[PDB]
Structure 1
Amino acid sequence: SHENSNSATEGSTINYTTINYYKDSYAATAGKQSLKQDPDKFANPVKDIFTEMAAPLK
């Protein structure tokens, strides 16, 4: 359709697939999100990355 781009997730790094019947996109359904993840952001935020096989401290 040809609607307004007022959804809370406009300009998001994930592609949503939704349904709507109004000129405003925030009225659209929740849809399907994209399935990416980035654990390292939280689980491994170290500057100098170390290997599994190695001894963390050397």
Structure 2
Amino acid sequence: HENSNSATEGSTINYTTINYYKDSYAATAGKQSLKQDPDKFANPVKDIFTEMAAPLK
């Protein structure tokens, strides 16, 4: 059927790859889901504020 053993196993992203062997890590890199989360690095702030506001109230 196919072993579920690739590096992106259980990942939150959905990949569609092609493979010819029992082991899924052999499969192609394939096309995948395009999600992002800039705020994790750009706005890791505890209390969000808006651009419209004055950052320091």
Bucket of the pairwise TM-score, normalised by the shorter protein = over 0.9
Instruction: Show the 5 A alignment for 1:1-58.
Output: 2-58=1-57
Compute the displacement of 1:51 (Å): 1.1
How many pairs align? 57
TM-score (norm 2): 0.97
Q: Which of the pair is proportionally richer in helix? A: 1
Q: Deviations over 1:1-58 (max 9, x none)?
A: x100010001000000000000000000000121000000000000000011000001
Following TM superposition, where does structure 1 have runs of at least 4 consecutive aligned residues deviating by more than 6 angstroms?
none
- Structure 1: stretches of 5+ with no match in the other structure: none
Q: Which of the pair is proportionally richer in strand? A: 2
RMSD: 0.5
TM-score (norm 1): 0.95
- Aligned-pair identity in percent equals 100
